[PDB]
Amino acid sequence: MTTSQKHRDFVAEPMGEKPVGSLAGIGEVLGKKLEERGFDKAYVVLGQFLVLKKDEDLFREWLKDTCGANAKQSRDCFGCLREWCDAFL
Amino acid sequence: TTSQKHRDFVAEPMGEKPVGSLAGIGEVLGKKLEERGFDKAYVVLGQFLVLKKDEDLFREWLKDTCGANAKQSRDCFGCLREWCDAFL
Secondary structure (H helix, E strand, O other): OOOOHHHHHHHOOOOOOOEHHHOOOOOHHHHHHHHHOOOOEHHHHHHHHHHOOOOHHHHHHHHHHHHOOOHHHHHHHHHHHHHHHHHHO | OOOHHHHHHHOOOOOOOEHHHOOOOOHHHHHHHHHOOOOEHHHHHHHHHHOOOOHHHHHHHHHHHHOOOHHHHHHHHHHHHHHHHHHO
């Protein structure tokens, strides 16, 4: 397994009310910028991922534009949501 | 009360279900949702979640987007709310 433990923990169970910082790739710096834009729970970011029809390009560009995520951070966040959805949606 | 359509939706993961599997979303509403990019139930769930599950704002968005009346938007909200309580 090449995913982070943090990815594995997120994808192992429903997310409920977990904060945005529970997503892989979302450290404290990105999580603060997300919360300040209203994306305060992980499920709100899931919401954006789903409204963008799970499209990697659009979602990763949106994360960059919204909180300054770099390529690795946006890849990790996308992959964590994609695998969560495959498991639970 | 709830419809069997509601109960069937809230009983399981929605996967790739079409937007018309949502309670309240009949043929006319579904067409208009699909025309605007909301072709699958999970895209509408997405909008519900971006709006932080807010009943008033989601039901207003649905009316603005596809013309849902009050019963249709009530039905659609309630099915997404109960689905999230079971699966999210």
